[PDB]
């Protein structure tokens, strides 16, 4: 693990639980919110042109950190400060508002500008929960186009694409 | 060699019989054809099964279709046309190389005898089957390009030799051995008597709606065209222990008796046709069978 984490910090080195990369690939906005991360929550991963080194079985950094709270046992801190501090040096905040939706909300006596950006856990728990447990009403999408590995490593890993729900009500006869 | 028949090889019909309609005429008044209609009558029978004998004390009711002659008419008419269309050796699907060596292996088949037996079933009346029984005298009239030939009742099984069958058979042999087509507008006439029950082909019901659904065409009783085609091709007397003529089949199948006459003992189609294309010479009776089944049709591909 140490050599490819060192390769990651020598690379671009960004981990995130929230992004706008899924809305448009020209996003480059990245924030790791802290209080929403629970034991089964999942996190995606970006480095430039989705590069990396395998762990001698074709295994990159993602399923490593994703597999059953692997990240948690370094985040809670039972693996020592030596790995935990180098992990914490990667989760930085990167701000960008270009080519993103920018909407308003009525707050108390006034309006507030805010940018909707996507969630990390929702896509991966969607691919692993509407699929395995027999929900038979969904749309399968692939982002991006013929080269989907431009966004993230989550984008890179599965090429079947994520799943949304159908929002089609039954209609009047 | 080993030209294995094309994965999909199929031969089209070279005999096109029509849906044989049934009519009611008189023996002297042969022109006033009363159209026999399929009626619907309900039937209170009994359970007759060779198991669980305790159900016989309780009856049962099913609704059938029936076709009866009108009481003022004592003869039934069967109208159909049979179109003998040539080029029996070119397939429809497949049809390439395998069929060409079949063509150059079958230029000496006795098409005269084939045409004679193919029109003998009309000359008698294999088509009728059940309408043939209980008939005082069958009379079939064949019209072909301004040449009307009346026949009586040729004994079905044994193929007798005469002159009036042979002229139409010469026309059919001139059609099947070359190019073109011929048409026989064929009318069967049988004295079944006043009102006796006649037997069209029977269609297919749903799960439970009718016990016996006769083949109706605008409410008129009619025979199936493939039933007529079974009748025309009932010529096969070349299997082992040849007792009675059956329909020419690739396996020699008689489904009503449940016996495979030619299957599994080299006398099926796919062995002596593969031998024909591989270069093994045939007799005068197997090659005429193989071209007769080419006139029959089907698919020949594994």
């Amino acid at each position: 693990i140490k050599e490819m984490i060192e390769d990651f910090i020598s690379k671009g080195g960004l981990i995130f639980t929230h992004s706008g990369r899924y809305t448009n690939t020209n996003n480059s906005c990245f924030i790791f919110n802290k209080n929403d991360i629970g034991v089964d929550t999942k996190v995606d991963m970006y480095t430039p042109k989705s590069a990396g080194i395998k762990n001698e079985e074709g295994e990159n950094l993602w399923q490593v950190l994703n597999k059953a709270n692997m990240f948690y046992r370094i985040y809670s801190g039972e693996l020592g400060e030596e790995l935990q501090y180098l992990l914490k040096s990667c989760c930085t905040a990167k701000e960008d508002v270009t080519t993103l939706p920018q909407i308003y909300f009525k707050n108390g006596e006034g309006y507030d500008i805010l940018v909707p950006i996507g969630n990390a856990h929702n896509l991966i728990s969607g691919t692993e929960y509407l699929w395995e447990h027999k929900y038979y009403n969904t749309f399968t999408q692939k982002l991006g186009g013929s080269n989907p590995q431009n966004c993230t490593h989550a984008c890179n890993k599965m090429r079947g694409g994520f799943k949304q729900f159908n929002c089609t009500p039954p209609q009047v006869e | 060699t080993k030209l294995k028949a094309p994965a999909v090889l199929a031969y089209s019909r070279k005999i096109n019989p029509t849906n044989a309609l049934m009519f009611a005429v008189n023996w002297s008044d042969r022109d006033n054809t009363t159209a026999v209609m399929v009626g619907t009558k309900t039937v209170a029978g009994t359970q007759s099964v060779r198991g669980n004998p305790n159900d016989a004390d309780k009856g049962n009711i099913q609704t059938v279709n029936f076709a009866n002659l009108p009481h003022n008419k004592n003869t039934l008419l069967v109208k159909y046309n049979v179109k003998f269309v040539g080029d029996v050796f070119k397939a429809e699907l497949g049809g390439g190389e395998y069929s060409n060596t079949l063509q150059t292996a079958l230029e000496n088949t006795d098409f005269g005898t084939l045409a004679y037996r193919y029109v003998y079933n009309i000359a008698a009346g294999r088509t009728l089957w059940r309408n043939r029984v209980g008939a005082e005298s069958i009379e079939t009239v064949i019209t072909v390009n301004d040449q009307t030939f009346t026949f009586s009742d040729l004994l079905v099984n044994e193929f007798d030799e005469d002159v009036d069958v042979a002229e139409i058979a010469d026309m059919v042999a001139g059609v099947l051995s070359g190019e073109g087509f011929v048409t026989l507008k064929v009318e069967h006439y049988m004295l079944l008597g006043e009102g006796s029950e006649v037997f069209p082909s029977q269609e297919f019901v749903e799960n439970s709606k009718l016990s016996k659904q006769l083949f109706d065409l605008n409410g008129q009783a009619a025979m199936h065209d493939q039933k007529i085609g079974n009748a025309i091709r009932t010529i096969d007397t070349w299997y082992e222990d040849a007792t009675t003529p059956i329909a020419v089949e690739p396996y020699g199948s008689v489904v009503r008796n449940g016996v495979a006459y030619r299957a599994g003992n080299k006398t099926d189609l796919f062995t002596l046709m593969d031998g024909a294309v591989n270069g093994k010479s045939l007799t005068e009776e197997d090659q005429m069978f193989v071209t007769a089944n080419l006139i029959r049709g089907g698919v020949f591909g594994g």
């Binding site: 507030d112 500008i113 909707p116 728990s125 509407l130 749309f139 729900f165 929002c167 039954p170 | -």
Partner: protein, 246 residues
């Protein structure tokens, strides 16, 4: 004295179905509750609550894959990269026939409210959609539940939306109960340090994440309470229901 104004059988065309990366199809209740603020700011009529059904709805695409137009080349930095088709990121669109109910207080004759919402329909867009045909609006007055049932019987036929609430979390509830989630509120994450890239340059801007809820599609002739079907602004940066959870 409350007043109801009704937009019936409005044909929306070009409406982008991507409510989120996980919910696609109908736009969220933030859209149809911000329509009220849109007519509160553009026109001036105060809208306090909103409810919506669906006469018809269809998302553009096939049975398991709905998808997106060939993108344009409307970016700087792609000078020689224009002969190729596009960079295509997913943005599915839809088309639907809708019914809309707005809670307004007018204190004036009803012959001005109809025209004042009519000229606002012709200039606004319904979540990127284009209005093709819409019925003439009419003003309804209800003071109790008995006269609110007169509002209930006149939207026949439509399929209205009521809140249903989450049990524990999203996809689990979507599985065992087989219901439908959609976005009902937004959670502030981080404040952008510079406002030179904003569209307003004065109001502070925060990044947001979509919070979801479960709903129910109900026949409008079989709903007990319309206030269970109305939606309005909530706290903080959320929407809710007058009638609560159904």
């Amino acid at each position: 004295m409350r007043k109801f104004i009704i937009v019936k059988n409005v044909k929306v065309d070009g409406i982008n179905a991507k409510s989120s990366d996980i919910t696609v199809g109908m736009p969220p209740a933030t859209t149809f509750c911000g329509l009220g603020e849109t007519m509160s700011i553009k026109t001036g009529i105060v809208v306090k609550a909103v409810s919506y059904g669906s006469v018809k709805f269809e998302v553009r695409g096939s049975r398991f894959n709905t998808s997106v137009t060939k993108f344009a080349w409307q970016d700087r930095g792609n000078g020689g990269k224009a002969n190729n088709n596009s960079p295509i990121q997913p943005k599915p669109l839809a088309d639907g026939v809708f019914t809309l109910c707005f809670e307004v207080e007018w204190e004036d004759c009803a012959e001005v409210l109809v025209d004042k919402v009519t000229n606002f329909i012709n200039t606004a867009r319904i979540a990127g959609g284009t209005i093709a045909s819409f019925n003439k609006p009419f003003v309804k007055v209800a003071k109790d539940a008995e006269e609110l049932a007169s509002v209930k019987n006149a939207m026949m036929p439509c399929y209205v939306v009521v809140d249903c609430g989450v049990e524990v979390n999203i996809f689990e509830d979507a599985v065992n109960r087989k219901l439908q989630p959609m976005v009902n509120g937004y959670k502030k994450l981080e404040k952008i340090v510079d406002n030179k890239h904003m569209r307003d340059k004065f109001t502070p801007a925060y990044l947001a994440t979509p919070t979801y809820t479960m709903i129910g599609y109900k026949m409008v002739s079989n709903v007990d309470n319309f206030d269970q079907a109305l939606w309005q602004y909530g706290e903080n940066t959320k929407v809710k229901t007058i009638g609560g959870i159904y």
